[PDB]
Amino acid sequence: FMVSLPRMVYPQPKVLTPCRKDVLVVTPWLAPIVWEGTFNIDILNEQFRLQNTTIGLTVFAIKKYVAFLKLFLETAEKHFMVGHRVHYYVFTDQPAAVPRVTLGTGRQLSVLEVRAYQDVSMRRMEMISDFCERRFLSEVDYLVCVDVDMEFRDHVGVEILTPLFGTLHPSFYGSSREAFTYERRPQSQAYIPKDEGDFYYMGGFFGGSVQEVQRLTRACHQAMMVDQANGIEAVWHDESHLNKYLLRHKPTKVLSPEYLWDQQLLGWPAVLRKLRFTAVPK
Amino acid sequence: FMVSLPRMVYPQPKVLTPCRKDVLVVTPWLAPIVWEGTFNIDILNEQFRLQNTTIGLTVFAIKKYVAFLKLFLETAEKHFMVGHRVHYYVFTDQPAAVPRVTLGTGRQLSVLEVRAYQDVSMRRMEMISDFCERRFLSEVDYLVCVDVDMEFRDHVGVEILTPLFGTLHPSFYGSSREAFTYERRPQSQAYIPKDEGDFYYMGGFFGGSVQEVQRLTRACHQAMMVDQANGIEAVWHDESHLNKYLLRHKPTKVLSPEYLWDQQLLGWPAVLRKLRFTAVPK
Numbered sequence A, B: 001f002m003v004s005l006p007r008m009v010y011p012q013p014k015v016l017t018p019c020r021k022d023v024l025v026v027t028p029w030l031a032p033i034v035w036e037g038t039f040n041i042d043i044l045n046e047q048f049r050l051q052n053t054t055i056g057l058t059v060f061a062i063k064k065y066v067a068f069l070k071l072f073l074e075t076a077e078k079h080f081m082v083g084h085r086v087h088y089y090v091f092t093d094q095p096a097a098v099p100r101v102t103l104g105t106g107r108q109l110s111v112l113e114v115r116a117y118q119d120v121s122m123r124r125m126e127m128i129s130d131f132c133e134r135r136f137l138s139e140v141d142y143l144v145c146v147d148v149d150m151e152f153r154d155h156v157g158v159e160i161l162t163p164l165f166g167t168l169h170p171s172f173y174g175s176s177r178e179a180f181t182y183e184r185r186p187q188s189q190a191y192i193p194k195d196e197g198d199f200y201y202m203g204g205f206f207g208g209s210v211q212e213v214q215r216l217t218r219a220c221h222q223a224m225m226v227d228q229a230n231g232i233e234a235v236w237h238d239e240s241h242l243n244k245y246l247l248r249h250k251p252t253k254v255l256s257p258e259y260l261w262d263q264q265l266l267g268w269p270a271v272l273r274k275l276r277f278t279a280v281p282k
Ligand SMILES: O=c1ccn([C@@H]2O[C@H](COP(=O)(O)OP(=O)(O)C[C@H]3O[C@H](CO)[C@H](O)[C@H](O)[C@H]3O)[C@@H](O)[C@H]2O)c(=O)[nH]1
Pocket: A059, A060, A061, A062, A063, A064, A065, A066, A120, A121, A146, A147, A148, A149, A169, A202, A203, A204, A236, A239
């Protein structure tokens, strides 16, 4: 049950004035594509606070990638879901190397030890699904699953939340589908033919409700096991499987490349009003 | 659980090319605004057929308005949810005046007798909520609630379906909120101040999931009873209450005026590529 919004004073949306004319803001299956200027964060914050929303954020920091945690977490504190309940889940082979980061109120962090192992990146799907299944369902409403070699520079908030989302890979958002680096070998479960595909989604930022994320990660894990049994490894590993899944199960929101950007590689194009979550040199 | 979509060949959506540049296609709370060119109906038909979706359509035909049923139903057969399961619920004081309309496969019609009574238009909220509650929950997935003094001229399909939707009133989609005919007396439960409001929604086309429609109709009925006890009748009756509800509970899709148009009164502006559901002279 959703209680009523309070009275709010804000600018009237005008039907005969687009928010953005330079970009696609809705997919052909009627999922919003999230860009700056498409949302009123005050309305969305109200909606999600009235539900006492809890967001889980998963991040893997295995072997040398523990070095990225301090900046990742410190900047998440500045920019990720501020004002909402947040539970970080840090998966690592080195629990003692997790930095002691000071958290705002209503935010918590759990360190989950895993075994260290391409395979590091792939096995995230298993670890997220099997068997963090039970824990996530009890503790959070949404899960957000990201790469650690990153920093938050600007707002990443409840505008992303939805049953299932993917994020446009910053190298391919202007590309034709034939150019997307989908798995192209028919022998792989991740196979997508040259005439199929909506977008190329980045493996380092996806999420949704706990139920939908567990479905996605279970399916991707199962598909990766089939490939392993058949002696084939998808070209971009878990990302190839994520792309196959999101082709056949359309996301209910798509995040623009504001949400996953590499300024060193790609600069700061006019079409990006904000750079929210960005690559750190590795 | 949602099964996988099959392989489909269709045009690639391009992020740097809007579908429509002349109109707002997403609200500030990230609800799609449904216009021609924003959706691929083949994708949406697949999604909804894979769930074996059943859509209920409620329509009231009381006193002289039984004359509108033949054209309403015959044109609904041509244009409303074709290919999907449909259950019409015709509420009337004259069961014998309901015309015998030939239905396509997977479609059915029930005649529900009510007592005849502004008040005719208002009491729809009670009749929809109390006590068709039980029946609708067992029989359909979505409910669509419309005026009868209308005809379908073009496609109205699963692109509208969502947990809760309203439709832009064709007289006000280009208007400033101060001009909207909201109830303006603070003594009414439907009261909206001059500095509040997103859109003016038409009382003759709303819908959603059964649960969300029962919430809306229950709330509007309760609010109308409070007004009656306080000796006040909202300026546009049930529509005034619908507008209050949708201000405080944002719809998850908004239908463009393609979905509720009056050509005699308003012509055929360039911004309307299709006239889908239109007023009949009364
Ligand atoms: O030793 C490890 C190795 C990985 N990891 C974990 O796995 C995540 C993904 O790996 P990485 O970021 O290197 O891939 P990326 O290189 O960012 C993967 C991305 O960039 C590619 C170019 O290198 C392509 O653009 C591809 O499309 C894109 O997904 C990393 O952020 C860590 O959370 C870890 O903890 N320890």
